[PDB]
Amino acid sequence: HRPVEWVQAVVSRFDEQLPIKTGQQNTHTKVSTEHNKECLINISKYKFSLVISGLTTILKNVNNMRIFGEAAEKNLYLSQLIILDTLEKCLAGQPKDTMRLDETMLVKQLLPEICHFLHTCREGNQHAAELRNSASGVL
Amino acid sequence: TFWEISSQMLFYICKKLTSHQMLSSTEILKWLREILICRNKFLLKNKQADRSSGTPPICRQAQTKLEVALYMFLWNPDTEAVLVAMSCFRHLCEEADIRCGVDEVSVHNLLPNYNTFMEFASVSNMMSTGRAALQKRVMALLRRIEHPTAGNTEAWEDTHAKWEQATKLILNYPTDSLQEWINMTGFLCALGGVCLQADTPVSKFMDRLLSLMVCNHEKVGLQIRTNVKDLVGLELSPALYPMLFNKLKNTISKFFDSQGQVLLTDTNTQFVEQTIAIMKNLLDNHTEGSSEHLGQASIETMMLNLVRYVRVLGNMVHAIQIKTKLCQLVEVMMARRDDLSFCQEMKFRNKMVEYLTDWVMGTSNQAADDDVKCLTRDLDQASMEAVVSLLAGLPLQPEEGDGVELMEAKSQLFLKYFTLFMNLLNDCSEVEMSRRLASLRHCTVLAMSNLLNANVDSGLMHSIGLGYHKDLQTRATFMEVLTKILQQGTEFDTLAETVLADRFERLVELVTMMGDQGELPIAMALANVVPCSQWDELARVLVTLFDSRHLLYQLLWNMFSKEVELADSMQTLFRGN
Amino acid sequence: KTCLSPTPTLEQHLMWDDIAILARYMLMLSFNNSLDVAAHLPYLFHVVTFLVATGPLSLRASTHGLVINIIHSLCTCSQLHFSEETKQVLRLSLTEFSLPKFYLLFGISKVKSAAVIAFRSSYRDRSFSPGSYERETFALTSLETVTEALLEIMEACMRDIPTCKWLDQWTELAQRFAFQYNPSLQPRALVVFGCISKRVSHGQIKQIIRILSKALESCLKGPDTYNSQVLIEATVIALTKLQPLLNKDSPLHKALFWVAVAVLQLDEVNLYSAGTALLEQNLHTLDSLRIFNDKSPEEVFMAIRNPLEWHCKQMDHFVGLNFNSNFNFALVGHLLKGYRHPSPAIVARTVRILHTLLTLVNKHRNCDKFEVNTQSVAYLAALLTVSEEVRSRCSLKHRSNVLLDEEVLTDPKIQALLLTVLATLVKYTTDEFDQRILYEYLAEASVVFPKVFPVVHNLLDSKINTLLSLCQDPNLLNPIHGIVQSVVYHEESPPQYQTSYLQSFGFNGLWRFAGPFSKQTQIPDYAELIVKFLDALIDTYLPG
Amino acid sequence: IISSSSEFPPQLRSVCHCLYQATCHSLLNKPQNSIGAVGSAMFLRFINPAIVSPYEAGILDKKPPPRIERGLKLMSKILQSIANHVLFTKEEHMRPFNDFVKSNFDAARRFFLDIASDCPTSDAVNHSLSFISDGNVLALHRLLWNNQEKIGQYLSSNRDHKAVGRRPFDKMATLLAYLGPPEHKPVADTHWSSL
Ligand SMILES: [Zn+2]
């Protein structure tokens, strides 16, 4: 009960440190926000379903966000780069449980979002190259 | 080959960094820092396997160049560059240990300034702050470079040429550049001591420095003068006081022509006005070892000449403010009189009181009929405080311009001031702003009391009239000072041998209280609280007192025990300051 | 004659003016030994104590001047023959009373000179014009400082004066007001009686303990609290001084440990502060009698509590702590509220009480005074963040002995309480150094004792949640991450112990009793059993 | 130096013992010899400086001839090596002298032991001079008055176990106030001077 509410703070605080989201100087040299990443990655080992589900919503929110400007585009590109990089580490970090009961998340929550990047994505010549490279490893 | 080649690389790269500024200079330093780390381990293993470790001329010729490039980066505007440079001193110190394990033989001989270098590490391990705050700590350590060194004596010169050329360009042109110049100026001052020792670059630096206090440049002249005063006064090395005062006095000395006639000039007026703040700031700051340097120079001649120029400046709202500060400057000069050196204290103090009495005119703002001139109240109020300090313990001595009996001359001299104070005392009467008169009245009453104490015999008769004064408050103060005179002895009379010895007999007992298990709380507590400046006085009193009480062993055991236990290097600390 | 018509304060009494005017006469007569001190000194102090720091600023400075002149007359009296040794003490005393320390004690702080305020120049042309009716408060501790300074002066003189009766006369005057109901003078007449009395009888003690029962009774029954909230503190303070004079073999020497505890439960800074002072000397006094040499504090205090255990059991139920289940943990929850006392001087007093108790339990078990065991674990948790030797002698294993040893702490209860202490100490504490040390020891407990850890979620839930959202300290945030990971790691299993496990065996109020002092100072309303408890103690231990 | 053990002043004898006790106490909590450190330190800092530059110390009015001075400088190095029991390393210039120092290792130790053998408490050694020391007292009173507030703060931090009424902190305020403010310092005819 109480730990369930604790997890949301870890997940919620991650969103508030996305470049697209106002920085607010909460990074504390990025050590504090990076420590949050480590705890979230470790938690996925026992709460893989919960951690994965939260990440999908964050990616969907970032994907379904309209912002214009060089800084805005860079923030979204860097924002998704961390999300994709964070997601891949959790998948790789997870032991070889071989639990094949994640079809629900894969079919709807995860595949459509990753499939968007796999397209040519000619909007950004340099950003799409990195996102596809990161997404391909996850796939 | 490793030292032959690795060292040869260091000499090439270090010379390039000093040659000119580059965009990636902050990056070479971080990489160059790692190069030192990667060659210390090789020496450690090399010495362990085979001491045999060679130091060819390139190793010495390149070890110096490493220092010559670490100092010049201490004043670098980039915060990271200076922070990295401070951390880079660890590798320089640690290298000494590997070459020679015994500290004293080589660590304190090959690297005389070893102890200060260790301090840089602690400062680096601190929260980041603006360059101004960081420069204070950096310049503090730069002022503690006791031992001259080839790197020190060459880093000072190398940046001196760079600083000089930068200064000319700014003035020649009829903001970022200035900020670097400020850092170079402050850096070039804190480390002056190493370059000390006729014509010398250090002396030429002062001459240009003194020639910048009066720098009148329409574009940035104000900022230059605003900053040279702030830094030179508050940051100069105490080892440069004997040279600053001599140059400062000589500059003033030529302001007066033959026959002692002032030559008023706006630049000379600005020069004296700046000299007041610098001297006040210089005297205001109390640091370790500053007292030792103040004794060498004689400040009497400069002070006497200074008042004459200000004395003839005239009367005006501006001139009153200058006179007010001068009165405050002399007040600060009387708190370090023990530290200062005086050839004839009596002859100098008497003249200063004579020169100051001219300015203390009461009720002169009412005659002027202008409230704008209320500053004269402060100037008179400030003047009294200066005279009070001057009069504290000063016997009167009349100038021998006329030949008369000394006793008569002194009595006339005493009544000259006694009347002056009484006249001002009447004006301060409430019946005739309350804080101004109340504060001024207190000072004027205190001034007379000090005058009587110095010479009771020649002034006792003139003061009897105060017993029946019109102000009840004044009468009380006179009786108190009079009461002390009775308690004092006219002669030795064995009065202190009996009264003071018994009166102060208990004093030693409290100080010499044998705390249980040798705690000695008074001695231990007194040691830390006492400022470092007076440690010389404290040491003699403690040693002398305990020896008389046959308890010296207890004090030594307690005092040494804390030092030895606190630092395992008992011997090193004892030789240290 | 004020007893006939008792008043809440002297200034409100009808005869106030009569006393005030009579004070001015005594002030003038003090100078130049116009008041015969050599025969009236006992009666001068008796009245000075009732006037110190009472009345308008003019009247308050008058009392200070009166004392200054009474001492001077003694030093300049020819009828008495004081040796040169004694006269030195008096001369030093005269200087001491002129220090700024005594200005605050008399209530004349911020006054440069008392004489100037005491006298007014234009006293013939116009009458005095009192004003600034706002009047500072007085603390009975200040009276002790003055009350004992004078007693030093009196004792020195009596050494020279043969067969002097000054002390006997002064005691008699106090004894009359000590055992008489007067809400305006009785509080002042009790703080001085104990400071000067040299002997006590069984009947006297019973009155002191039986006046407290009525003082507590008045507070709850009526709406006037502050009036009766100072008679309680005076009763304890008086007893705090009479224990060192009690018989070496009196039962009350041990029964005065429960009275102090019952006073700390009233949630008042003054009452709580006074209780600790009684406890501190109670332990020291018992040490001189060598009563814990062969027994433990629990054995002694619980042995004397047995005859009236039935009444005590009811009180323990309401407070939410039990001493039969665990004496050393119920005796430390009451001592954890001291950390919340505004005065920095009471925090140090409770720390001394902790050290003294720790050295006694270990000495009973001969465990080196710093070993970790079941009995001496409660006293070490409190001292972990304030005692360096405790931290050094008991260090976390994952950096001598290491705290949290599971070899001896193999009981869920003995280890559940130690977690309750740790959670409580962080719930209200606000310090980076203290929180860091406490959290580092909490992570190790999570893994070493996973089963009992989930009973501490509610206590740490709010603070951790707030810290996690906004904290930006890597040093303090790293231990938090380990705790959260351990919780999820040890999750997925049904809680063997729920959060309410402490309520099962009585200790449901351990966290509540250590909270901050309530601003709305009010009687907890369960003191009605303390009155019954005290009554049983008197009948059982004071037959007559 | 070894022969003149008796001529050592009593004051220094107490000072040397304190270092010996400090080193012995330091070693206990931690083959270093306490006497060796004391002997090396005392000789290097007390005896050695006078030998190197007697003129600076004022022993000789006229500066010794440079040739004589060189012998004194080299003498100090040889003598210091004896105290430290260190042979000549990469010092072939002076290596032949290493033989002489070997015999004198024992002699140096005896001199250090004599001073270091003084009783920790001078119960036997007594000198009831009890001089008034009026001049020194005057400085002490002035210093205490100047730091009356600051010295109190240090006492305030500690001593909570027992009330300060009977302890220096209470006594200092009472006694110091009784004495009153110190008198003004007298003027100095001589120029500024230091120890
Ligand atoms: Zn001279």
From Swiss-Prot, chain B:
Segments crossing the lipid bilayer: none
Substitution effect: R575P: In NF1; complete loss of GAP activity
Site (Arginine finger): R575
Record-given protein name: Neurofibromin truncated
Native source organism of the sequence: Homo sapiens
Gene name for this UniProt entry: NF1
Residue span relative to the full protein: 569 to 1278 of 2839
From Swiss-Prot, chain D:
Function of the protein: Stimulates the GTPase activity of Ras. NF1 shows greater affinity for Ras GAP, but lower specific activity. May be a regulator of Ras activity.
Source organism of the structure: Homo sapiens
Disorder cited: Neurofibromatosis 1: A disease characterized by patches of skin pigmentation (cafe-au-lait spots), Lisch nodules of the iris, tumors in the peripheral nervous system and fibromatous skin tumors. Individuals with the disorder have increased susceptibility to the development of benign and malignant tumors.
TM annotation in the entry: none
Quaternary state and interactors: Interacts with HTR6. Interacts with SPRED2.
Effect of R45S: In NF1; significant reduction of GAP activity
Domain notes: Binds phospholipids via its C-terminal CRAL-TRIO domain. Binds primarily glycerophospholipids with monounsaturated C18:1 and/or C16:1 fatty acid moieties and a phosphatidylethanolamine or phosphatidylcholine headgroup. Has lesser affinity for lipids containing phosphatidylserine and phosphatidylinositol.
Protein's UniProt name: Neurofibromin
Signal peptide: none
